[PDB]
């Protein structure tokens, strides 16, 4: 073990990679192992409640999840030579080279069908592992899907994850997923939801790999449900009997009653992928495929990612965003 005791000097910081939910995040070089890591820094006492509960939850969850497609937290180190509130903690993760959002907005890489086959296979395998354990991610999006240069997909950002009991009657937090990846039952106020919320988010990822943009881009819940209905069909009991049991079904709805145009709006997508795509964007959560069923579908069944040449990406991440204020 030694989880928590060794010091930060045993790592060489290379630079700041970004900002997290409870402190800065550093790219760092291990002195000895020869492997690269990312360090999520945890300052304490800046908040008068000490070690942040957001880290506790992420630490507690990541120790029970170990999978090739899940972000790997290796250990926790400290500044050392503490008494002395100066000492801070650092969560050690294996370094990943890109996130899907930065990879797509660079405009520099093109994913063909086989590339998306391998990515979704790894993503659905990792999510199935989380769903056979009793964990919901509740924050899947393009920026939380990490990718290295060996072509390996890994799921990250488990801070918002929580344990669920199957078909049990216990309530949760309603506004969990970012708006562009939030399923319709959450937009209508479902609070006792299911792992289908993660599958919807992955369905948005799949369509966003064939198109270059997110498929549902709105800035408010009312408009977001409108764009979803314009493509996936309006929520109604014919396709989704339980919409009448949802808190906001009557007070927020599209102007028109839309018919499902998903196969015509995305006709350029190959048939097998469009079949999985249609399966993942079912309005009714009970009709939405599970991660297990998604692995058994035509598009992903025979995919062995370890036997496919990875697509070549920029050796580092750079969104190449035009100067804009």
């Amino acid at each position: 073990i030694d989880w928590g005791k060794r010091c930060v000097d045993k790592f060489d910081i290379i630079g700041i990679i970004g900002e997290g939910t409870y402190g800065q995040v550093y790219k760092a070089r291990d002195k000895d192992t020869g492997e690269m890591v990312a360090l999520k820094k945890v300052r304490l006492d800046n908040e008068k409640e000490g070690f942040p509960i957001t880290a506790i939850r992420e630490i507690k969850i990541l120790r029970q999840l170990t999978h090739q497609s899940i972000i790997n937290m290796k250990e926790i180190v400290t500044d050392k030579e503490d008494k002395k509130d100066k000492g801070a903690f650092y969560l050690v993760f294996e370094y990943m080279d890109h996130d899907l959002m930065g990879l797509l907005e660079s405009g520099l890489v093109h994913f063909n069908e086989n590339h998306i086959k391998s990515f979704m296979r790894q993503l659905m395998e990792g999510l199935d592992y989380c769903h056979k354990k009793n964990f919901l991610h509740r924050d899947i999006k393009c920026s939380n899907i990490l990718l290295n240069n060996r072509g390996q997909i890994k799921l990250a950002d488990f801070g918002l994850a929580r344990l669920y009991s199957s078909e049990e009657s216990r309530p949760y937090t309603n506004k969990v997923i970012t708006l562009w990846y939030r399923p319709p039952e959450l937009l209508l106020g479902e609070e006792r939801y299911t792992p289908a919320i993660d599958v919807w988010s992955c369905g948005c990822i799949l369509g966003e790999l064939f198109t270059k943009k997110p498929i549902f881009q709105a800035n408010q819940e009312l408009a977001q449900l409108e764009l979803i209905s314009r493509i996936c069909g309006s929520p109604c009991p014919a396709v989704w009997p339980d919409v009448i049991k949802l808190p906001y079904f009557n007070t927020m709805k599209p102007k028109k009653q839309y018919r499902r145009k998903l196969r015509e709006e995305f006709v350029f997508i190959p048939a097998a992928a469009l079949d999985l795509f249609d399966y993942m964007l079912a309005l009714d959560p009970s009709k939405r495929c599970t991660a297990e069923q998604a692995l058994q579908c035509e598009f992903l069944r025979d995919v062995e990612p370890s036997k496919m040449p990875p697509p070549d990406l920029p050796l580092w991440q750079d969104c190449h965003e035009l100067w804009s204020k």
Partner: protein, 244 residues
């Protein structure tokens, strides 16, 4: 995954005893520390799982640190503070010190020094390193309920057995039993003791009524001598109190 279980010989060489503290005084310090966590968290309306998690942090802490170097009530307040955050029942640290101030006299509250709050905050870093960030803990309560659900001898006598076994689990937290045996074994042991004190015969209620080894259906290869020793440690807490 770390290892969190000691034998009777290793518990006789804790850091406190190495510094000259007698076994009786450390056992008393552990009782008062566990009961302190219990009373403070009770007055704040905390889950019994949260109380048990703070107490388990407290017992493991003093397998690596000495009571002569770390005052017990400061450590207890720190363990309850971390446990509430782990068990998703957060409580502001200001509240724990306030509640601790309400139950302790000035000589006991003197352990918090001039500024009581900072003593708990700076200790949280030490506690986390000591428990090796192994935050998830399970307790005998869930197994007592799970094992009792599979008894069918008599409804009223089962509930009396569960109720006495639940009380014995609370008493167990005042000892190092959680450092000796897995929570499943503690669950079986308190049913065994409750069955003795009630003169109920638990074997009658199993699917194998003819078979005294009624517990080998729940835990594998647990000899009766282990259960007898757990009972002896628990009844030791009743050296003064009436058993029940």
């Amino acid at each position: 995954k770390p290892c969190w279980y000691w034998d009777k010989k290793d518990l006789a060489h804790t850091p406190s005893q190495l510094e000259g503290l007698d076994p009786a005084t450390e056992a008393r310090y552990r009782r008062e520390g566990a009961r302190f966590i219990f009373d403070v968290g009770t007055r704040l309306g905390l889950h019994y799982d949260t109380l048990a998690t703070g107490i388990i942090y407290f017992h493991r802490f003093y397998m690596f640190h000495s009571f002569k170097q770390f005052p017990r009530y400061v450590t207890g307040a720190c363990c309850l503070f971390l446990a509430g955050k782990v068990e998703e029942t957060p409580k502001k640290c200001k509240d724990i010190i306030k509640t601790a101030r309400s139950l302790l006299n000035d000589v006991q509250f003197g352990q918090f020094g001039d500024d009581p709050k900072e003593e708990v905050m700076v200790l949280e870093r030490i506690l986390l390193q000591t428990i090796k960030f192994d935050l998830q803990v399970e307790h005998p309560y869930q197994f007592l309920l799970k094992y009792a659900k599979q008894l069918k001898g008599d409804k009223n006598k089962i509930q009396k057995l569960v109720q006495m076994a639940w009380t014995f689990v609370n008493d167990s937290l005042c000892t190092t039993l959680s450092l000796q045996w897995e929570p499943e074994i503690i669950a079986v042991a308190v049913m065994y003791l409750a069955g003795r004190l009630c003169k109920f015969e638990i074997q009658e209620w199993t699917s194998k009524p003819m078979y005294r080894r009624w517990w080998e259906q729940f835990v594998q290869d647990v000899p009766v001598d282990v259960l007898e020793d757990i009972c002896h440690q628990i009844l030791d807490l009743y050296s003064q109190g009436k058993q029940q």
